Design a protein around this ligand. Sequence first.
Ligand SMILES: *[C@@H]1O[C@H](CO)[C@@H](O)[C@H](O)[C@H]1NC(C)=O
Ligand SMILES: *[C@@H]1O[C@H](CO)[C@@H](O)[C@H](O)[C@H]1NC(C)=O
Ligand SMILES: [Ca+2]
Ligand SMILES: [Ca+2]
Ligand SMILES: [Ca+2]
Ligand SMILES: [Ca+2]
Ligand SMILES: [Ca+2]
Ligand SMILES: [Ca+2]
Ligand SMILES: [Ca+2]
Ligand SMILES: [Ca+2]
Ligand SMILES: [Ca+2]
Ligand SMILES: [Ca+2]
Ligand SMILES: [Ca+2]
Ligand SMILES: [Ca+2]
Ligand SMILES: [Cl-]
Ligand SMILES: [Zn+2]
Ligand SMILES: [Zn+2]
Ligand SMILES: [Zn+2]
Lengths: 131, 263, 396, 131, 233, 276, 276, 276
Amino acid sequence: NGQIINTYQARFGTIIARNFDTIRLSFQLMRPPNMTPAVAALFPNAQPFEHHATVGLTLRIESAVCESVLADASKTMLANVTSVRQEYAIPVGPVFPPGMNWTDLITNYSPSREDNLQRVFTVASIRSMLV
Amino acid sequence: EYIENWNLQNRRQRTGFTFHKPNIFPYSASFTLNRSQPAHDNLMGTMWLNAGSEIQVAGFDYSCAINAPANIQQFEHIVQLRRVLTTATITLLPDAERFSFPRVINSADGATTWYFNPVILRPNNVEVEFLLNGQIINTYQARFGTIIARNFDTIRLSFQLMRPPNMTPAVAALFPNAQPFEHHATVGLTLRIESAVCESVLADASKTMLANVTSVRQEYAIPVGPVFPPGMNWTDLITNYSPSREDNLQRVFTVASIRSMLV
Amino acid sequence: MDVLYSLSKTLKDARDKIVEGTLYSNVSDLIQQFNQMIITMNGNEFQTGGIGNLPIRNWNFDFGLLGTTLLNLDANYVETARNTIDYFVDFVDNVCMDEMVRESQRNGIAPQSDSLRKLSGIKFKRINFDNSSEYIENWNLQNRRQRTGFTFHKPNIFPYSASFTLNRSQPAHDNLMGTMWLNAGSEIQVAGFDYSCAINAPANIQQFEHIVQLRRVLTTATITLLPDAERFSFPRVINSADGATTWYFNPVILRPNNVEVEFLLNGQIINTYQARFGTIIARNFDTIRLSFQLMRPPNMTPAVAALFPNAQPFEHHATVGLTLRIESAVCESVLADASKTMLANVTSVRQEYAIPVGPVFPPGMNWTDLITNYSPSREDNLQRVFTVASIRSMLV
Amino acid sequence: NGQIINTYQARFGTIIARNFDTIRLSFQLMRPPNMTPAVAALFPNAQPFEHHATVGLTLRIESAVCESVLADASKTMLANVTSVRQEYAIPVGPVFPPGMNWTDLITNYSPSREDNLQRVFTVASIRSMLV
Amino acid sequence: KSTIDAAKSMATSVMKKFKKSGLANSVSTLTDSLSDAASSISRGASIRSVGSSASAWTDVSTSSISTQTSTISRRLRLKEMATQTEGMNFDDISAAVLKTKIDRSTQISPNTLPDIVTEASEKFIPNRAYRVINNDEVFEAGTDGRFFAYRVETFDEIPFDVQKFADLVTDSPVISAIIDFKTLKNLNDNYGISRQQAFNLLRSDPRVLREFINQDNPIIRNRIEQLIMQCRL
Amino acid sequence: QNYGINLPITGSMDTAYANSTQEETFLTSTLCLYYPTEAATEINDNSWKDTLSQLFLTKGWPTGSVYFKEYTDIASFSVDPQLYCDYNVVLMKYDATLQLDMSELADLILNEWLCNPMDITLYYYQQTDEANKWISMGSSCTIKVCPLNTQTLGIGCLTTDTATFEEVATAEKLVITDVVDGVNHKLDVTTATCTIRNCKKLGPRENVAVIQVGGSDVLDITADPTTAPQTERMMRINWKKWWQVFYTVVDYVNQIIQAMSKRSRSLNSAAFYYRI
Amino acid sequence: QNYGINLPITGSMDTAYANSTQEETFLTSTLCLYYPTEAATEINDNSWKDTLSQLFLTKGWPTGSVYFKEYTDIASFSVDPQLYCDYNVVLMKYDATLQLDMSELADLILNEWLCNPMDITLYYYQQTDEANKWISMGSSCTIKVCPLNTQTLGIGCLTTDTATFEEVATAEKLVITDVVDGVNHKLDVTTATCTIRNCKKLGPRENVAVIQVGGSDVLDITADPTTAPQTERMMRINWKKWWQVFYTVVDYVNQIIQAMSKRSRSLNSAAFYYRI
Amino acid sequence: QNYGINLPITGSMDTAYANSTQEETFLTSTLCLYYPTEAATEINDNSWKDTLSQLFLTKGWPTGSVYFKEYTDIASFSVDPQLYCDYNVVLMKYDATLQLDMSELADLILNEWLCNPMDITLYYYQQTDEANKWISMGSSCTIKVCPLNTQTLGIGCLTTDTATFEEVATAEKLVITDVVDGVNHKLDVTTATCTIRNCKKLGPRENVAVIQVGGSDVLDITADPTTAPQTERMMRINWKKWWQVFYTVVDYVNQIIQAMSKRSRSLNSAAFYYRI
Ligand SMILES: *[C@@H]1O[C@H](CO)[C@@H](O)[C@H](O)[C@H]1NC(C)=O
Ligand SMILES: *[C@@H]1O[C@H](CO)[C@@H](O)[C@H](O)[C@H]1NC(C)=O
Ligand SMILES: [Ca+2]
Ligand SMILES: [Ca+2]
Ligand SMILES: [Ca+2]
Ligand SMILES: [Ca+2]
Ligand SMILES: [Ca+2]
Ligand SMILES: [Ca+2]
Ligand SMILES: [Ca+2]
Ligand SMILES: [Ca+2]
Ligand SMILES: [Ca+2]
Ligand SMILES: [Ca+2]
Ligand SMILES: [Ca+2]
Ligand SMILES: [Ca+2]
Ligand SMILES: [Cl-]
Ligand SMILES: [Zn+2]
Ligand SMILES: [Zn+2]
Ligand SMILES: [Zn+2]
C-alpha cells in the first residue's frame, strides 16, 4: 500500500518479502573508472555507440502465500477448469475472459472474478480428488 | 497416489499421475538445415533443445528473409511426446535464450564447423498446436504466458521470421541485400510444461522415485538387467518407453514410494 | 515441540472435522483429544513475548469441554467449539512466534521460550498425539538419533557466489584463460573460456575444472546437466580480481568436450557421469567436480577460421559451459527450498517484531551467510525454528 | 562461524577462548625507528640482506572442551585402538587412514570418521577399565 | 602544507570567494525573507505557506506533497547554517570530508583552495533529508521529494501530515537524517535495536553512529558510504 | 612472482572498484614522443618542446615526464629502434611507397620479440613455427636465401654459388623475412653492414602506440596474409600542419594512453629481447 | 513537444510492424544531390538532370522532388555549405592530397554543430571539452595560435609579436582547429577573408550522406586519434565514368535513404546552428 | 600464465630435494667470458679459445655454449656494457688508479638498473630516494651540477652561468652520480659524447659475476658509505699468468655458476613486470 516493508541492497542470493504488493527495483550503470584497452575501445567519448552498456536484474518468486486463489506451477486447478470448459465448448460467460486466459484474468482480477475463480478452483480440487 | 494408481491399473481402470515439471522430453540438442552449403555462410534452419519439461527452439535465417516470397520465413518444430499428457499448464515465452548468442556448431556429420551469430527478431505469427493422434486439440496464436493443453501427445510450434519493413540505419546495416551475412536473424520460442497429468509414471522434479530406484541399483552394484537401460538412464528409458518398461517402471516406482514412506 | 505440534494439530483437526451435520462417529476420537487438550491446559498460566517488539501476552485457560453423546453435530456444537478454537489458535500462534525468535549456542535444539519450556513438562505429555508431519517425524527420529532426512525440491544448498578464476592473465587482459561461475540455490553455471581458443595448448585441448563443496551431504538427488552456461554466453565487462581495472569478455560458445561430472563423498568417487546430459542421479555426495575441455575444431569453415587467428589480437573468445540444476534431493539437515515456506516464515516473524540479532543466526536471517557457515549449532537452532514454523503454518 | 568470539590485543600469557573454531593470529614486523649502531648495521637500506628480521608467535592449548572425541596428551584411547589394530594386523578398512594415523584422520575428520572414532574410543575406555 | 607568503591571506582568501557563493546568497535570501515577513502585517500574502502560520521557513514559492516537502527541505539546508539543529549536522560531515581531502591531496594549492572550499560546501551531499520529532511521531522530508511519517519506538509508517510537518520544522529543533528512514527500518528489522539506540539514532547522536560502525554494521556503513561518495565536487 | 606465476587468481564479480595502494619503482610515469625531423623543421621553433611539456602539464603530466625523441625518417629509425619511456607514442609520417617498411617498423615496435644471433656463415637455419621470423637491421641489409632439400642441396640455387640465391631484401635498413617453415635455408647477408637474428613473436607490446600521420589503413603487423588486425595502439590521423598534429596528440593523450598499458616497458630500451 | 520531451515513451515488444513507409517517404520528401563540376563536364549533356529526375521517378520519387547542386571542388564547397533538401547526398571526389580537407568537410556536414561568434581581437579563447572546436570558413583562413599560461603570458610566443605565433592553418577554405583544452589562446586570423566560430558537436546529422568517389576509407570525422568511425552515411564507391556513378546512386537510392534518418533537416540550410 | 600479478607461493618444509640440475643447467645454458685485451696478448696463442672450449666441454659445457668477449680495458668496457649470455663472467684486472671506475663498472653490471631518459636542456632533476642515481655513459662524460632551492635559484652557482657549476665528472667513460635527494639540480653535460640516464637500482643482477684479477678488495657497489658489501658474485684471485687465471676459471666454473643464478628479469615469469 505504498508503505516500504522490505529493503535489500546489494543482496542477490535469496531474500524474503514478508508482506508486499509492489516491487521497486533500482539499479545503476556506473561507467568503470579504469578500462583495459579493449574495454576503453568499446565505449567511445562520442557517437557512434556500437556497443551499448546494459545492467540486468532477475527476480523469481519461488514460493509465496496469497489470500486469493492464483495459478501456480504445482497445482492443476486452472488447467482442470480450462480443460473442462474447452472440452464441452462452453460459451464465453460474463465474468471470465474467453478461453480462461490467465493473463487477462490476472490483469483484471476483480472481486467478482476472484469469487468465481475461487468457487471453480475449489470445485476443481474436489473433482481431482476423484478423477 | 502411487498405490491408488497401482490398484486402478490392477483393475484396468483409468490411471492418473500428476507431475510438476514432468520429465517427458529426452535430452536432444539438434539442428536442421533447410538451406545449406559447404561454406555455411548463408544458412536457414532450426536448432532446438528438448530436455525435461523444456523445449527451446530457434529458427534462424542468415539472409534475414531478403529473398523470401513475402520477406517471411516459416519455421516449424514438431515434438512427439512418447506418452499422452492431460491437463497440462505450459508457460510459452517468445525468445529462446539458449540459441541467442554466438556459437560454433559442428556440421551434421562432424566434418567441419559452422558459425552462428544470432540477432534476435521477435517471432511472428506464432502458432502452438497441441495434437492428439494427429487431431488438433488445442491452438494458441500470438499467445504467451500460461496456456492450457488439456489432452495431447504432440506439440507443433510454427513461427515466422518477418523482415522488418522499416529499419533504422543501424538495423539496416546488419541485413544487406546479398552476401556476406555477418548477422543472422533468429526467432526463438520457449515452452515449459510446468505441470501435467499422465496415465503412465514419469520422472519429475518434485518426486524422488527415479532417484531412489537408481540409487538403490547403484549402491549394491546391481548388474544391468534385460529391461532397463544401463544405469537407469532416463533419456534411454523414455526414448524407448515400451509397455514392458512401463510395467517394470511402475512396479519399481511404487515400491520406491512404499520404501520412502519409511526411509 | 511434540506437545506444541500436538496442540496445533488438534486445533487444525478441530477446524476441519468439527463441522455442522457431521456424524459424532466421525469426530469421537477428535473430540476426546480436544477435551484432553482443554483439560490439560486448564488452570495453567502462560506468558509469551518479551523480545523485540513481540508484546507481552498472558494466556489463561478456563474453557468448558464438548459433548459426547449426540448423534450428529449441529450449529450449536460448532458455535460452542469455535470460541475455544480461536483462543487456542491465538495462543499456539503466539507460542510459535515466541519460540521462532529465539536461539542459544549451547542447546539450540532445546526449547528457548518460557512457554514451550513449560509445555515440556511431563503433565502436558498427555496432549501429545499423532506426529505425522514430515518435520515432526524428523524431529522425533533425530531425537532418537535414527537415520532420517528431509526431501527438498530445488534445495537451496549453494550460497550465492558469482566469481571467476584466471589461470592465464596479464595487465591488459587481452589473452586470458580461466573459469567463471555462478553458484546460486540449486543451480551451478560454470564456463571455461580461452581467449586464444587453445591454439598453443597441447593437443589443442584446454582443460577446465570446477569443484563445489556442499556444506551438507545430499542424498538421492536428481540433477539436470546441460552443456551450455547461458549466464556467461554474452559480452561482459568484468571487474579485475582486485578491482583495479575492467576487462572485456566476448564469448563464442563451443560445445564442451570430455564432460565429466563426479559426485564425491569425503573424497571418494560415489557417482561419475561422462558425456551424459539430461537427468542424472547422485545417490550420496557432498562435492561436485565438473571437468570439461575446450577442443579446437580441427576443421573450420571460413567464418569459423576467421574467428580464431593464429596469434593476437583475439577478438572472439572461445567458451565452453555447463549448467547443473538440483531438481530434488534428500538431506539429513534442514535447508531452504523453493517449495516450503519455513525460512520465509521465520524471517518474516523476526523482521516484523524487530528481534535483536542473536549469537547464532546471521542478522536478517540471511540465507547465504547461514548456509556458508552452517555449523552444528546453527543446524540445531534452524531445525528447531523450522519445525516451529511448520507447526505455526499448520494454523497460520 | 566467521564472527569474532574472542579478541586479544598485545596480551600474552594465559587467555581464555570460550567458544571458537578458527584462530587468526595477526602480527607485524615494525622496523625499529631508532637503532643502536649494531642494530643499524644488521639492516642496510638495500641488498644484500644477511640478517633477516623475524617476528614470531607461539600458541599452546593447555586444555579445552570439544563435543567430538579427540586425541590428547592424557587419555590413551587412540593409543589403545592403534595398538589393538597393529597387534592383530587388522586390514585397512573404508573409514580410518591405513595406519590409524592421527594426522590423516584429524585432517579429513568426516562425520562417519567421527562416529566410528567415538565408538572405538568408548570401547577402548571400557576395555581399559579392565585391561 | 602552508606555502608561506600564501598563509598570510589563506583564511581571507577563501572567505572572499565564500561570501560570493550560492550558500552565502541563500543565507542572505533567508535572512531577507525573514526580515520582510517580520516587517509585514499585510505584506505576507506573497508567502506561499502550508502550515497554519505564515513562515519564511515554510515558504514554497517555486505529487504536490513531494514538491512542497522538497521546497521546504532545500531551505532547511540553512537550519544547519543557523545553529538550529541538534543532530550531527550534514555540513560537519562535508567539512570533515573536505578537511581530509585537502590534507591528503597532493595537488591542492593556496590559489586553488579558495572556491574549492566553496564548491565543496555547495556540492557536498546535494540531496539530504531532515527529520522532526514531536510526541513520538517523526516527520522526515528530503530534497528528493520523499517524505515519511512514522513512530519512534517502532518505525511504522504513518500517513504524512503536511501542515503539521511545516509548523513543526518552523520552530522545533530540526535533525539531519544521516541515518534516513529506509536505513532505520532496515536496521530495526535485520538488527532490531534497543530503545536507547533508536532514540539516539533518530537524533543523530554521534556515539551510537560510531558504535554501529565499530561493530561493522553493513547497513549503517552502507549509509555512511553513500553519504561520503555523495561528497564529490 | 616466478614461484607464483602458475597460480590461479580468483576474483568476485561484485568487488567494488578500487585503486592500487602499491609503490611503483618511479614516482610517476614517463611519456616519449617519437616524431620525424620534418615535424621539427616545419614547426620552426626552438622552444616548442618546452611548450609541449607545459601543455602536457596542463594535461596532468608533471614537468619532467614528457620526452621527445627526434628521428630522421622511418628507414633510419627502423635500425635498432629504442623505446625509452614508460609510454611510447611514435608519430609515423605516411609515405605511399614505404608501406612495407611502415608495416615492418610497426610490427617490430608493437610486438615483443625474442631473438638470437645467426652465424649465417657456419649453419643453415629453419623457421620452426609461424611465430618465427628473421629480423635483420643495419646500415644496409641485403639478404639472399637458398632453400635446401632433405639432402642439404639447394632447390633452384647452388649452395656454393651465391649468384643463384633468391633475393628477399635489397638495401634494407630493417627487414622481417618469413620463409617456408621446416626448410633449411643457406643465407648470405651483408654482415658487414647489418645484423640478422632469428626472432620469435611473443605477443603485443601494449606500451608502444603508433600514430600514422596521413594516408589510409595500410599497416600489416602480421605476416599471415589473411589477417590485418587494427589494434587500438595503431591510430591514424589526417593532417596539413604539424602543430595541429601535436596539439591533437596532447589534447587526446588520455585517450592515447588509455589504449596502452604500463608494465610492458622492458629494462632495456631495445625493441627485442636478445639471447646469445 | 517540448513539454513532453523529458517524458518516457513506453512500447510493448509485440506491436505489429507497420507497412513500408519508403513510398510515403519518397512522395513527401525532397532529395538533394551534390556533385562536382567535373561530373557535369564529363557527362557533357544539357538534359542529364532531367534524365536523372525521370529515373528517380521510375524509382518512386515525384517529379519535382530531386534537386541537383553543383560545386567547383571540395575546397570551394566547404565555404558555408548549404544543405537544402530533406535528404542530402554529396558525391565527393577523392584526392590523395586533400585528405584532411575531405575529412573536415565530412565532419562539418555529417554532424550537427552549435557555433558562436569569436572576437579574436578582444578575448582570449579556450576549448572547454572534447566536443568543442574552432571552425573557420572563408576565402582564405590563416589561423595562428599563441597558448598562454596562468599569468596570461604566452608560451613559445609573444602576444605583442604575431610572428612568433604557432601557425596551425594557412590558406584554408575550411579548417577545424583543435587546441589543448583548458588553455587560453590568443588567435591571429585573417578576419578580412575568414570567419572563425566556437562550435560544439551536438551529434550526428543523419539526413546528410557522403559518397566518396574513388580512393579508400580515409575520412576521419572525429578529432580523437583513437577512433575513426565509418558510419552508415559514409559510402565509398569505385568509378571510371560519372554516368555509372549517377546510375548507382539512382538505383540504390532506397539503400542510401535507408541509411539516413529524416526529421534532422534544420529550418535553415546552414551546416551549423549559429547562436549569439 | 598469470604474469602481471605477484601471487604468494606455499611450500611444505619437509617435501624433498630434487636431483642435481647443474648438468642440465650447463647443457641448456650459455656462458660468456669477458677479459681484457692484454690477457689475449700475454697468452699469445691463436687457438686458445678452442682449447678453453674443449676444457669447458670436459667440465660439461656443450661446444658452442661458451663465448669469449674482448674489451680493451675497464674504461672502454664501461661504455654501455652488453652482457647477453645466460651466465656472465667478467675478468676485471685490478688497477689501483682506477678503483672508483672499477666499482662503478661493477655497480653497473652487478646490479639491475631501470633507467629513464634525461633532458638536461628542458628539465631540472631530483633524486627521489636512495636507489635513484644518474648514470652517464659515453666517449667522454663531463657532468657539472648546480643545486637549486625552493625559489629555483642556484646554491653557490648561477643557472645562466655554467662556469659556476660544481663539476662532479670529467672525461668519464662511465659515471654514477649521487646527489642530495629532494633538491632540484641543473645539469650541464657533454651530450654530444655522453648520454645521462635517471636510473633506479631495483636489485642484484643474478647472472653476472666479476672476478677481480689482482689487488685487494676495493669494490663498493653501494653509494652508502656505511656499507661496502662483498657479494658471492664478487670474486678475487691473485695472479701472475693469464693462462693460470683461465685454468682456474675453467676448473672452478661449477662454483662460479653456483654463486650465480638465472637473471630473474630475463625469464618468462618476469613478463609484464618489466621484461620477459
Ligand atoms: C499494409 O499491407 C497490407 C498487406 O498488403 C495491406 O492489406 C494493408 O492494406 C496495408 N495498409 C495498412 C494501412 O495496413
Ligand atoms: C634422480 O636420481 C635418482 C638416483 O640417481 C634416480 O634413480 C632417479 O631416476 C632420478 N630422477 C628422478 C626423477 O627421481
Ligand atoms: Ca624494409
Ligand atoms: Ca635461383
Ligand atoms: Ca615461416
Ligand atoms: Ca597480414
Ligand atoms: Ca581544410
Ligand atoms: Ca613560436
Ligand atoms: Ca580541444
Ligand atoms: Ca579520429
Ligand atoms: Ca668513472
Ligand atoms: Ca659555484
Ligand atoms: Ca641521492
Ligand atoms: Ca658503500
Ligand atoms: Cl520449479
Ligand atoms: Zn552443415
Ligand atoms: Zn518447482
Ligand atoms: Zn584480472
